[PDB]
Design a binder for these strands. Structure first.
Lengths: 226, 226, 224
DNA sequence: TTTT
DNA sequence: TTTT
DNA sequence: TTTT
């Protein structure tokens, strides 16, 4: 099985650990043994002019996934929204009401459907490939999320007198001479990881430590030696 | 405390990782320090003629648990159903409605009650030993579940041009020359593990990796060198 | 950021692993990198005269947290009750009704408000420091909980002819010549730990193993 | 409720 | 629904 | 709500 998935993750945090905006949207291609990805795309947001409320994220995700899908022709696309695995081309007012989610989630996806359902329909007509709202259950979505963490640190390294990056849930990053490695901290997930090439700038220090206000999320902090 | 528990787990998967049927029912005796089992029984189902909505699993579990219990005389039997630790001999329509569970769970256990409650009642009359629906809270149940994973791999090795075994949640297996070792991947459980003696066949290769559609579940895949 | 948090944890168990009463209330000061605490207070309960439904735990916690806060002057106090981070001084029946919690949770905090809300307002007036009900979301709270586990084992060491201590969720303890080290068993938490100096008595054996009735909780057993 |  |  |  070959799967393309996408996710947005990583946030700039202020000094009191409040998120300012998100950083990276990533689409990944995942193949057996489903532990990493060797082919991926990234789109960076502007975290300082980001609306957390919101929903530019899912639109960017489905677009980027389709873009990667046109190149690598996967069996299926996984979208990071836990709706029970329903096909996005089948999302109308009727099927959304039947979904087992909150009344808030329903009214929101009714709004999203107006743009996303035609998009998925067209792509399915072209290829037969479904875009499914699978979310939390998907390992490829989790690998995308890890890559969003990695690319968030890459963005931070490239844009830093100091920066705080809130990583996606329970993952760590490690800096090497010419690359950034990201790993899940949850061994129950079976060793999920990512690796991205980058030049590491000089004159800066970094630290990885727990977000004190959001348990199981780590902060990657960059400081200038200046 | 000496505990007999049982669980059914391990599934044959098709190539799209969809479960076909379950494989192993195991009953274990668990004693201090409650990390493994040295005395256990196994019953193999036919996964290609299995009704996944048949719920033959729990009936198989309580029978196998009672069978082992008669041999080792434990203090209590743990059944894998998270009902708050209620005694099975006390399960009637009255007590089931009072349970803090789903309405589907309630209707499932009203039917199950018809056979299981008399079974538990007789066993208690005979021995004084309760059968409790403790489920997720039980460490002996989790050890039973880990052994079901191991015996499923043993079954796979003994019955394979290729097989996909879907393991119980977040556990790994290790193949040695004359045995299979199973371990929880969750260190929060405090190091739960099992070990089963077996002959490992020639002319086959294997791999353990994440199920891409079900996060925190692993797949054990066997392939012929063919 | 400098944070004071508190928690009650650790229980005496009987031979069938049923909890009898809680042992330790701990308040900690937590600073960057937010993995441990070097400054903390402990208050021991009487586990053999404890009402597990009494909710003395939360009253003891806010008292001890405030006590430590007066000394180390933190930015904020974290209380171990998952109410969304609401300020305790802002807790009246009106704001409690709006809380996204169970009807039982609401009626418990209806009761608690009578004493704790004036206390928080009083403390805020004196220092400007908020007491927030953040609970599960807080790392300092988890560090307090780990310390409650450590102090429960110290209590076990100080009172042992034999004892079963049920530790807080998924943590381990290790006994060294002159100290007890406690660690989260969950690597997702990113390496939370604590360490307490104590004199370890002679003539004792101890063992740590899973509570067979409560998955992901460990038992500390000590014998003479 | 259980199951991957 | 998603986000730290 | 919290506790093993």
């Amino acid at each position: 099985m070959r799967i393309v998935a996408a996710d947005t993750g990583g946030a700039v945090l202020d000094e009191s650990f409040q998120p300012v905006g998100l950083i990276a949207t990533v689409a990944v291609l995942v193949e057996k043994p489903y532990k990493t990805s060797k082919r991926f795309l990234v789109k960076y947001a502007d975290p300082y002019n980001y609306d957390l409320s919101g929903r530019q994220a899912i639109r960017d995700e489905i677009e980027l996934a389709i873009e990667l899908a046109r190149e690598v022709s996967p069996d299926v696309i996984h979208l990071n929204s836990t709706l029970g695995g329903i096909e996005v081309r089948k999302l109308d007012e009727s099927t959304i009401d039947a979904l087992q989610i909150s009344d808030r989630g329903k009214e929101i996806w009714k709004e999203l459907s107006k743009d996303l359902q035609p998009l998925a329909k067209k792509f399915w007509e072209e290829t037969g490939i479904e875009i499914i709202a699978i979310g939390k259950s998907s390992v490829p979505v989790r690998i995308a999320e890890i890559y969003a963490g990695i690319f968030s640190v890459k963005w931070a390294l490239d844009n830093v007198g100091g920066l705080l990056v809130g990583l996606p849930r329970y993952m760590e990053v490690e800096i090497k001479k010419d690359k950034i490695i990201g790993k899940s901290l949850d061994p129950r997930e079976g060793g999920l990881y990512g690796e991205v090439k980058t030049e590491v700038p000089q004159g800066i220090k970094w630290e990885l430590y727990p977000n004190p206000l959001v348990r199981r999320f780590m902060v990657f902090e960059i400081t200038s030696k200046s």
